[PDB]
Design a protein around this ligand. Structure first.
Ligand code: NA
Ligand code: NA
Length: 196
């Protein structure tokens, strides 16, 4: 099954070409020490421009798995969402999880948990990178996602995150909750408090 050689990439920059995406991933894999031989690990990229996602095709199962470590990497201001194809199943005795860490890359997977934060009231002109930088001021992030409209790509003005250090959570709340920005006022609280 070809699905062990392919990844979904969501939240791609508008107007990006398949070649630009391929060059980005091939370079990052090499610069990060993930590539396992001479030559390019990514063989092809198929972009769905209207739906805002791509699929990457890799030359090996192992390099496909390692590339999962790039989930959340910023590309032209956007956090790339890297995921397995929905019809992927690991073969027995194979780990589906990457074994290398990429410095500075913050996962987009923010599970509901004790210290998961909601940040509402963000100006909609801030991209994923700038909201991430706002939050990183308080301490390193374990995970982060800025919510966007799936049809237009515009920020919906709220995000979720998890700090590496659970104790930074209350520091970010103290520094950001109630902050006024024009007509908006930030609400920063554990996401469990106001989850619908
Ligand atoms: Na879309
Ligand atoms: Na988007």
């Amino acid at each position: 099954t070809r699905q062990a050689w392919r990844l979904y990439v969501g939240n791609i920059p508008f107007g990006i070409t398949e070649e630009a995406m391929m060059d980005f991933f091939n370079a990052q894999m090499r610069l990060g020490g993930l590539t396992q031989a001479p030559g390019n690990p990514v063989l092809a990229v198929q972009i769905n421009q209207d739906k805002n996602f791509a699929f990457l095709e890799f030359r090996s199962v192992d390099e496909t798995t390692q590339a999962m470590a790039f989930d959340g990497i910023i590309f032209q201001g956007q956090s790339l969402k890297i995921r397995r194809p929905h019809d992927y199943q690991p073969l027995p005795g194979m780990s589906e999880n990457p074994s290398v860490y990429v410095p500075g890359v913050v996962s987009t997977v923010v599970p509901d948990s004790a210290h998961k934060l909601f940040i509402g009231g963000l100006p909609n002109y801030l991209n994923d990178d700038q909201v991430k930088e706002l939050l990183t001021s308080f301490g390193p992030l374990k995970a982060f996602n800025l919510v966007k409209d799936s049809a237009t790509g515009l920020s919906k003005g709220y995000a979720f995150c998890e700090y590496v250090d659970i104790n930074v959570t209350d520091q970010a709340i103290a520094g950001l909750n109630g902050m006024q920005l024009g007509d908006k006022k930030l609400l920063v609280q554990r996401a469990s408090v106001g989850a619908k």
